Amino acid sequence: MVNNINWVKLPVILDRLLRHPLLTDLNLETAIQYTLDFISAMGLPNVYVDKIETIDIKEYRGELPCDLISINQVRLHKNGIALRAMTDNFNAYPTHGEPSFKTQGRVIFTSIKHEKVDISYKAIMLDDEGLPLIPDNPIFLKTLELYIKKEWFTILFDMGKISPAVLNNTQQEYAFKAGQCNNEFVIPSVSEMEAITNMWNQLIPRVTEFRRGFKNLGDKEYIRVH
C-alpha cells in the first residue's frame, strides 16, 4: 500500500451515508454489521493489526488468543523454526519429523507435546469502545458507503420501494469502487517494490524464507567480484 492507514471511528461512515434521504434509518448497529461484512469480503491484510503472542503447548494442544482472526506463522520459541500445516491424519493418536500445526477454534493442534510457540496473528484495530476501527482512506470510505447503500437498496428493491435502474446504478458504482479499493490496498509501495525486486532477481535462488519468519524475503542478493 502506498498510503498509510490513519484510523478513524465507525460513525465517520454515517457522516456520509445519511446525506442520502433514503439512508436516514441506518444506525451504528447496522453500520457495525455491514462494515464487518465489507472488511471480511474484501480480505485486505493491511486493515488488520499485526500482533505476536506466545503460548504454551500442554500435549499437542494450546490455548489460542481471544482476538485472533488469522495466523501469519507459528514457530518454536527456543529454536525459531517455523511450523507448517499439518497434513497428518493421526497426529496425537499412537499405535500399539518436521513440526507442524493446525488451528480450528480457540485450540491449536501442534505436533509437539510440551513447548512454547510464537504465533504472529492478525486482529482488528478497536476503539476506546469495543467496536471496529476503520481506515479513513476516502476510497475505502466511499466503497464501504456504496456497500451499505447497495445492501439497503437491495432490501428496498425486494420490497418494491426502489426502481430497478436505481439498484443497477448502485451495483455498478459499487463494483467499480470495490475493484478500485482492492487495487489501492494491494498494489505495492516503492519500499515494498524494493523488497519484491530483491526477492525476484536472485542469481542463487533463496527458497527457505519460511523457516525464518520471512525475515530475508526482501534482502538483496550480493555476489562477490572475482
Binding site: 538483496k220 542478493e221 550480493y222 555476489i223 562477490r224 567480484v225 572475482h226
Partner: protein, 46 residues
C-alpha cells in the same frame, strides 16, 4: 590490472563503488589474456 583480472570502474565511466559486489560493481572476464598468451608462446618457440 586488466590483464591481472582487476577492473577499475573509473576507467570506463564517471563514478557517481569501493565494495567488491556486483549489485553495484562490474564483473571482469579475462578474454584478452589468450590473445597475448598465444603470441608470447610463439615467442618462446621461435
Amino acid at each position: 590490472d586488466l590483464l591481472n583480472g582487476r577492473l577499475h570502474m573509473s576507467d570506463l565511466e564517471l563514478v557517481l563503488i569501493k565494495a567488491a559486489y556486483i549489485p553495484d560493481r562490474l564483473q571482469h572476464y579475462p578474454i584478452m589474456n589468450s590473445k597475448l598468451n598465444v603470441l608470447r608462446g610463439e615467442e618462446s618457440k621461435r
